[PDB]
Design a binder for this molecule. Sequence first.
Ligand SMILES: CCO[P@]1(=O)N=C(C2=C(O)[C@H](C(C)(C)C)N(CCC(C)(C)C)C2=O)Nc2ccc(NS(C)(=O)=O)cc21
Length: 559
Amino acid sequence: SMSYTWTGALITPCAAEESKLPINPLSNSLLRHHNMVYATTSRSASLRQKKVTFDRLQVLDDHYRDVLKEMKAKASTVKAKLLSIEEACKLTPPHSAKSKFGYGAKDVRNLSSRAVNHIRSVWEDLLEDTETPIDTTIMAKSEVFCVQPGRKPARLIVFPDLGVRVCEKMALYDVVSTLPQAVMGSSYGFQYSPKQRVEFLVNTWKSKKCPMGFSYDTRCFDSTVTESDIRVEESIYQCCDLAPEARQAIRSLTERLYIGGPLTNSKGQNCGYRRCRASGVLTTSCGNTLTCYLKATAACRAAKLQDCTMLVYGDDLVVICESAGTQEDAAALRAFTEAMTRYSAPPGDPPQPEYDLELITSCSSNVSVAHDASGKRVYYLTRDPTTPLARAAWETARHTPINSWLGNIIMYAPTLWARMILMTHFFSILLAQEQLEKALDCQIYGACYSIEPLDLPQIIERLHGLSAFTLHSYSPGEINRVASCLRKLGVPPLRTWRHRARSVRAKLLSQGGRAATCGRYLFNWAVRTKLKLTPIPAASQLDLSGWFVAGYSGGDIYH
Ligand SMILES: CCO[P@]1(=O)N=C(C2=C(O)[C@H](C(C)(C)C)N(CCC(C)(C)C)C2=O)Nc2ccc(NS(C)(=O)=O)cc21
């Protein structure tokens, strides 16, 4: 079966599409090579349509079936609740795509009678009709990148109407929030804050006599997900204790939405048919994580990899195991790839065995080492800053729904690039515009959060510990990756950022209050006569319940 079939109608935009970085003094202070930065548009959609459209080979074996039974035995411990209409409505992002049936996200959030009435009729239709395919919209996603030494085509998103999305929450929010950890335990990546993630990786690595690890990159994961995969996923959901309406909603959503369905473009034209995972549904993250875990765990057994520990974030997979020696690891890994290939999940680039933890990439990130105020080694996660910086420049010049920069500051807070460049740049702008107090939207593990920049110190402390504000003596490799990135993009060198930060820090300290705390903690690296930093009282008091429970990419979730 084909992942997609197409009619010939175009994937169309619903408004003008910007593709060039504007020439703006605020973005230009950060990044001068503006022609290197682009945004994708619907104009490249057909290139992506070609990449994501292919026949799927799938042969299931005893290892797969054994693993699946083990996962279902754990799912059987779960009791999931049906969410009320009110709770589902309050999970809807304020700017979520309006319904085609005369109401939008604001109305959903306000519980207006039209929205509520339409959501109830959608729920009742899920209970009564177990087969009719549910409509979806296909759109090209606009994302910002740096040009390569050419251009990435737009990614495609597929999502159902607002009424359906609210019903998905009712039936499945509790399931997708609870079941993955119940099934996958320590392997489930969305449960970990950044410090907890680094500790898991480092401890797993140090728990092996002679560790070997690898990442495994599936080509076009969503498109490799077969109808069988999606029914297997439902078989796992169905092991939960479920309200009978939830049980029917899940069965109906699985047949009418998740397995596939018709695609309509923005103009209302029939565009094609999907027989693979939709990116824009509540179960995308959970389903992808279960599927990846199932396939990878069974393939580890087929390959005879010894004492495997996996970390899974949707389609993103890392495996750390005991080395059997260079040649035998190389052979085992190739056997792993062939087993995954049989399960429909062939690799983009063949996986490579790695004998150094810092050379393994999970979620484009690697572990690196710096030192705290006392000289003690601290492990932290980092990445190549090229895409974060390109995106930060875009978001400086253009008001954007989700601020990637804020997510990058929060999650990569210990890195030299987030600290020296992103904090300096964005605090400088917020100070000048007197917007330090204005709540901004970002996305953390797929969910949308509204965050005030002035709360950053206590958010960073909780997620990373106080060492985040004292790291120094970064590794030569990391320094040289940042420095070469800055040269490439026309970003001023680190010495310039140090000068700018000292100025920002003084203005913050002069303001007192929460702004002075930002100066003291976020910019202590900028001064030689350091302030002695103690736990922020507000940190222990922060409600970070629901931060690192699950992933919700594509799932239209707001907290
Ligand atoms: C696509 C973005 O949504 P996700 O839930 N979010 C992340 C994720 C983060 O939120 C952050 C952020 C920097 C983008 C803010 N980031 C870095 C986290 C780390 C510092 C602990 C390594 C992520 O990987 N990482 C993700 C990784 C894989 C998937 N796979 S999927 C589409 O099958 O659900 C999804 C996600």
